């Protein structure tokens, strides 16, 4: 969804970093 990885960390648990956003299972968080 709107999970960002600007700080190098996501709020959503088990989310992968994809600066400046976050993805999980190949899908945006």
UniProtKB/Swiss-Prot annotation:
Keywords recorded for this protein, A-Z: Antibiotic, Antimicrobial, Cytolysis, Disulfide bond, Hemolysis, Knottin, Pharmaceutical, Plant defense, Signal
Family, per entry: Belongs to the cyclotide family. Moebius subfamily.
Role according to the record: Probably participates in a plant defense mechanism. Has antibiotic activity. Has a diuretic effect. Has a uterotonic effect in humans. Active against the Gram-positive S.aureus with a minimum inhibition concentration of approximately 0.2 microM. Relatively ineffective against Gram-negative bacteria such as E.coli and P.aeruginosa. Inhibitory effect on the growth and development of larvae from H.punctigera. The unmodified form has hemolytic activity, the oxidized form lacks hemolytic activity. If the protein is linearized, hemolytic activity is lost.
Natural source organism: Oldenlandia affinis
Keyword Transferase: no
Protein name listed in UniProt: Kalata-B1
SS bond list: 5-17, 10-22
Post-translational modification: Kalata-B1 is a cyclic peptide which occurs in three forms: with unmodified Trp-19, with Trp-19 oxidized to form oxindolylalanine and with Trp-19 oxidized to form N-formylkynurenine. Oxidation is enhanced by exposure to sunlight.
Signal among keywords: yes
UniProt note: domains: The presence of a 'disulfide through disulfide knot' structurally defines this protein as a knottin.
Biological process, per Gene Ontology: defense response to bacterium; killing of cells of another organism
Reported tissue expression: Leaves and stems. Lower in roots.
Coiled-coil residues: none
């Amino acid at each position: 969804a709107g999970e960002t990885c600007v700080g190098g960390t996501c709020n959503t648990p088990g989310a992968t970093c994809s600066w400046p956003v976050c993805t999980r299972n190949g899908l945006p968080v």
